[PDB]
Amino acid sequence: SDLGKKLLEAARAGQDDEVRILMANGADVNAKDEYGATPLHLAAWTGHLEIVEVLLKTGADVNAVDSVGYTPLHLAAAEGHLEIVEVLLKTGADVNAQDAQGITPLHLAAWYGHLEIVEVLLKHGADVNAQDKFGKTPFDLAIDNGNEDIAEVLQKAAKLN
Amino acid sequence: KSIRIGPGQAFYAXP
Ligand SMILES: [Ca+2]
Ligand SMILES: [Ca+2]
Ligand code: NA
Ligand code: NA
């Protein structure tokens, strides 16, 4: 309600105890902003690990999708937020979630150069050669954006499935 | 390409 807006702002701004106060006061954990983001997307995006943990404990849908099909795991993988990617995967995140352009968390971590994140996604069963709407794999995105070290990690996981 | 993405901001959007 009124509380949904306040919850989105607190999640986004990293006010962890204000998040705890609004949740106990009945705020909708799955409130969505104008672009479809829940408080869990905004906390994951902005690297607020404590708030991620609080929202997951208070019932947040770990696989909520925004207006272009991003999950919280997409945004944490793109921003390189390792501990958030781990907690999301331990609490039921879909490691292979594709947005509306067929982009996965592995595609985003490969492009934006997050090698530790790429390894953690593979560990948790990321499809190493997921193709987007342009036929591109995470390997092609790592090559295209000059992250050859991530390309090597991905070509070794593909040879050994 | 964008240096960052975010909610509502698709990965493939021109530059
Ligand atoms: Ca605290
Ligand atoms: Ca595959
Ligand atoms: Na392809
Ligand atoms: Na390079």
Numbering used by the authors:
A (entry chain A): 12 to 172
B (entry chain B): 1 to 15
Could you give the paper's own sentences about this structure?
The V3 loop of the HIV-1 envelope (Env) protein elicits a vigorous, but largely non-neutralizing antibody response directed to the V3-crown, whereas rare broadly neutralizing antibodies (bnAbs) target the V3-base. Challenging this view, we present V3-crown directed broadly neutralizing Designed Ankyrin Repeat Proteins (bnDs) matching the breadth of V3-base bnAbs. While most bnAbs target prefusion Env, V3-crown bnDs bind open Env conformations triggered by CD4 engagement. BnDs achieve breadth by focusing on highly conserved residues that are accessible in two distinct V3 conformations, one of which resembles CCR5-bound V3.
In order to define V3-crown epitopes that lead to broad neutralization, we co-crystallized bnDs with V3-IF (BG505), i.e., the V3-crown mimetic that all bnDs bound best. In contrast, V3-IY and V3-IF mimetics in complex with the three bnDs and 63_B7 adopted conformations that were different from their original design. In all cases, a loss of the mimetic’s β-hairpin conformation was observed. Since bnD.1 and bnD.3 also target the V3 post-CD4 engagement, the conformation adopted by V3 in complex with these DARPins must either be a transitory intermediate state that occurs prior to CCR5 binding or an induced fit upon binding an intermediate. This conformation will hereinafter be referred to as Inter-CCR5-V3. In contrast, the Inter-CCR5-V3 conformation was sampled less often in the MD simulations, suggesting that bnD.1 and bnD.3 must have the means to efficiently interact with V3 prior to the adoption of this V3 state. Despite different preferences for the Inter- or Post-CCR5-V3 conformation, the bnDs overlapped in their contact patterns, engaging mainly with R/H308, I309, P313, F317, and Y318. Overall, we observed that bnD.3 forms eight H-bonds, distributed across six V3 amino acid residues, thus potentially leading to the comparatively high binding affinity observed for this DARPin. Six of these bonds were established with the V3-crown peptide backbone, and as a result, this should make bnD.3 less sensitive to V3 sequence variations. These features probably contribute collectively to the observed higher neutralization breadth of bnD.3 compared to bnD.1, which covers a BSA similar to bnD.3, but only forms four H-bonds with V3.
